């Protein structure tokens, strides 16, 4: 379902989606070469190469891949797309060691329940706050982890006919666990719950007038885009999108404890 056909779109300025249905990938274009934000799952790396070229770009102009975070179905993707560009892959530094090896940490959430991935070479750390330079574009890293170790979400500005956007590429701040793991307490990931609770809190605090989640449907991506044909761009701006993204986040969370206790 998630790998499921959507035609790509101009969001603001040079940002475009370029993912699929129900997982997300962005496209900051420039003429000095393009920041490419995820892969999806391996299913979804064509698609989003296919989008790539639909709108009129090349993939060999993909100069950056940045990863949300190191999961199977947001960085699957990022090997073949790597293949397909030349690109050097960035991620935090918990994120860039599984990256690099595909092998999913035993301190995941999810450990035990996440498939490997195809190793990624030419990868680089980058560090909470650290700023991705490319010509123009200016792509920050805030880390966010807690859905994992390495989770991070990115924030840029776009800019067109005078007006300029926040964007937010939001990771997922969901608490979810495979069996062992609990947030109330693990000592695999013993950060996990002060982790995620910080990361909600990041994200609701961000400057942000266009929100795009690692799930699109989780940011309410197409009740947004849904206006586009009425109101062009201005579809995808609302101040309130990260509040209330990280919002949902903190009542799911909520949930995850109570659902934890009945275990304990
Ligand atoms: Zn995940
Ligand atoms: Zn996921």
Redesign the pocket.
Known sequence: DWNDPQEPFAVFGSTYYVGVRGLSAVLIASPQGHILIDGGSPESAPQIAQHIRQLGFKLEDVKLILNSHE?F??AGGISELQRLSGATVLASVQGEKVLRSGQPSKGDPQYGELPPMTPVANTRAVADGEVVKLGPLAVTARYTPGHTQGGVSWTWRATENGKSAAMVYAD?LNAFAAKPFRYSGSPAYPNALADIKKSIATVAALDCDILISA?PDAGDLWRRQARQAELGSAAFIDRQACRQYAERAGVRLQKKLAAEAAEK
């Open positions: 999961h179905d947001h997922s799930h």
